[PDB]
Amino acid sequence: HEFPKPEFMSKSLEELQIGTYANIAMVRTTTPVYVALGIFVQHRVSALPVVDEKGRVVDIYSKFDVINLAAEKTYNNLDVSVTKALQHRSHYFEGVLKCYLHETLETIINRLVEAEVHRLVVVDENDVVKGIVSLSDILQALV
Amino acid sequence: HEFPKPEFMSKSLEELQIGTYANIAMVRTTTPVYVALGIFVQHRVSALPVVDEKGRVVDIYSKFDVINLAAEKTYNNLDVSVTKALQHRSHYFEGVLKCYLHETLETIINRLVEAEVHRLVVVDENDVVKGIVSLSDILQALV
Numbered sequence: 001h002e003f004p005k006p007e008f009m010s011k012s013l014e015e016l017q018i019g020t021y022a023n024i025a026m027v028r029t030t031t032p033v034y035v036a037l038g039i040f041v042q043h044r045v046s047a048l049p050v051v052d053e054k055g056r057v058v059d060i061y062s063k064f065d066v067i068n069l070a071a072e073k074t075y076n077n078l079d080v081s082v083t084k085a086l087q088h089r090s091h092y093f094e095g096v097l098k099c100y101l102h103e104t105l106e107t108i109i110n111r112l113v114e115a116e117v118h119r120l121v122v123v124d125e126n127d128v129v130k131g132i133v134s135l136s137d138i139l140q141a142l143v
Numbered sequence: 144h145e146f147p148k149p150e151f152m153s154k155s156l157e158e159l160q161i162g163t164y165a166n167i168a169m170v171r172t173t174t175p176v177y178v179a180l181g182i183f184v185q186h187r188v189s190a191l192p193v194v195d196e197k198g199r200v201v202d203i204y205s206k207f208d209v210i211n212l213a214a215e216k217t218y219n220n221l222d223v224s225v226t227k228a229l230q231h232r233s234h235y236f237e238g239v240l241k242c243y244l245h246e247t248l249e250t251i252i253n254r255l256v257e258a259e260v261h262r263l264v265v266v267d268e269n270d271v272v273k274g275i276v277s278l279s280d281i282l283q284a285l286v
């Protein structure tokens with residue numbers, strides 16, 4: 001009763017049926033922060049895939065991103081795009097934004113731990129959103 | 144419509160009525176990881192204050208901590224104390240574990256952003272748990 005069990009580390013996301021694949025909330029690169037704030041508070045989601053004009057995932061915008069914005073010493077208002085969070089970090093260029101259903105849990109876990117990120121966006125061959133895998137989903141499996 | 148509003152940044156946690164102060168789930172320094180895993184999955188909490196034999200807060204143990212454990216290349220099982228997470232980070236010694244009701248939102252926000260942590264444990268004069276303030280609680284206010 002190695003933790004985690006090797007036979008489950010070698011399995012794919014699809015095999016383990018890990019993630020949420022319906023009713024995903026997401027925003028656009030052109031979305032103002034005030035919109036994200038409203039959805040976080042009222043809809044009760046902790047992070048939102050951020051998609052470009054072509055429907056492709058280019059970032060993920062989280063509650064921590066809003067708090068980071070709040071702590072900036074420079075003058076801001078809520079009418080700035082969610083893309084301003086990109087000044088602080090790039091999940092995209094670090095390869096810690098996306099994953100595929102065929103990837104193993106060992107790959108997924110290592111990718112999360114690499115950048116200390118708490119979720120990944122499951123995408124298709126066009127980088128369009130299929131779903132989300134967060135720490136909660138991985139734990140649910142691990143038990 | 145500066146964000147965040149200065150008049151709310153200068154206010155205290157107590158003034159803004161931000162945080163959860165009832166029904167807090169928490170564990171001990173002697174608690175095995177398997178116990179934490181069960182509570183995360185079944186009870187639906189994302190982080191647990193970790194208290195010593197004297198009831199004092201010495202760490203906070205989160206879902207990410209379990210995933211970090213899962214990614215360790217060395218052999219582990221679930222019968223290791225939650226204190227093994229201390230090998231990776233010390234929220235305690237970095238001053239990013241605890242806060243007080245009289246502290247301002249500006250102080251709290253800066254402390255969260257300092258270490259990229261997602262919650263703090265509200266403690267009394269003896270460092271005993273009074274409550275929790277997470278990103279969700281700060282956002283709820285900010286609106």
Ligand SMILES: NC(=O)c1ncn([C@@H]2O[C@H](COP(=O)(O)O)[C@@H](O)[C@H]2O)c1N
Pocket residue numbers: 019020023024025026045046047048049118119132133134135136137
């Ligand atoms: N953006 C979303 O819609 C979304 N983001 C996460 N989730 C799901 O919400 C649940 C809780 O996730 P978390 O514990 O990270 O808040 C998990 O099952 C996760 O896949 C969603 N439906």
Ligand SMILES: NC(=O)c1ncn([C@@H]2O[C@H](COP(=O)(O)O)[C@@H](O)[C@H]2O)c1N
Pocket residue numbers: 162163166167168169188189190191192261262275276277278279280
């Ligand atoms: N350990 C706990 O019991 C606990 N930890 C967080 N909370 C509360 O749960 C709510 C959701 O927090 P989060 O979004 O970080 O999961 C917030 O209001 C927070 O104060 C708790 N009751």
